[PDB]
């Protein structure tokens, strides 16, 4: 049997947090601030994913270039094997040629 | 394990309630019940 026998603990949400209450602020900083910043400079994340999308193969190629030097060994190897697998999949396999 | 099915019970009972008058393991075991309930319909 795979169903809870009791109700789960209640999930109370503050829709008026500082984070929720100030989501989206300064997202028009360029068009409302004489184009001195960009919302892509407002993005906070990994250094290889600030203002760039990519698919998985493009993301793996991009991370190995910006930070493959300062990268742990096992995780670098795994990235090299991942790029090799994704090259073979995206260039040779599929239904549409 | 994000996004798992949490209502599979109610799906199994939606099939199984039409088999409770059958004889044998097909009245309670879903893998045999479905085969016999489609045939009853």
């Amino acid at each position: 049997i795979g169903i809870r026998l009791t109700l789960p603990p209640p999930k109370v949400v503050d829709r008026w947090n500082e984070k929720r209450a100030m989501f989206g602020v300064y997202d028009n900083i360029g068009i409302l601030g004489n184009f001195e910043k960009h919302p892509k400079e407002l993005i906070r994340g990994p250094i290889w994913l600030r203002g760039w999308k990519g698919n998985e193969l493009q993301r793996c190629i991009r991370k190995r270039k910006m930070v493959g030097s300062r990268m742990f060994a096992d995780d670098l190897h795994n990235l090299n094997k991942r790029i090799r697998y994704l090259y073979k999949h995206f260039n040779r396999h599929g239904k549409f040629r | 394990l994000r996004n798992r099915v949490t209502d599979r019970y109610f799906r199994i009972q939606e099939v199984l309630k039409h088999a409770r008058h059958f004889r044998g393991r097909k009245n309670r075991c879903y893998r045999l019940a479905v085969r016999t309930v489609i045939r009853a319909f």
């Binding site: 795979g2 026998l5 109700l7 789960p8 | 798992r4 949490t6 209502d7 109610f10």
Partner: peptide, 26 residues
């Protein structure tokens, strides 16, 4: 433990229904 609330709520209403058809109220 699976995430969610809706199936647990449905199962609790099912449990309440069977308890009634088991110990029927006066």
């Amino acid at each position: 433990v699976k995430k969610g609330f809706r199936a647990a709520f449905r199962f609790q209403k099912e449990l309440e229904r069977q308890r009634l058809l088991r110990c029927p109220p006066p």
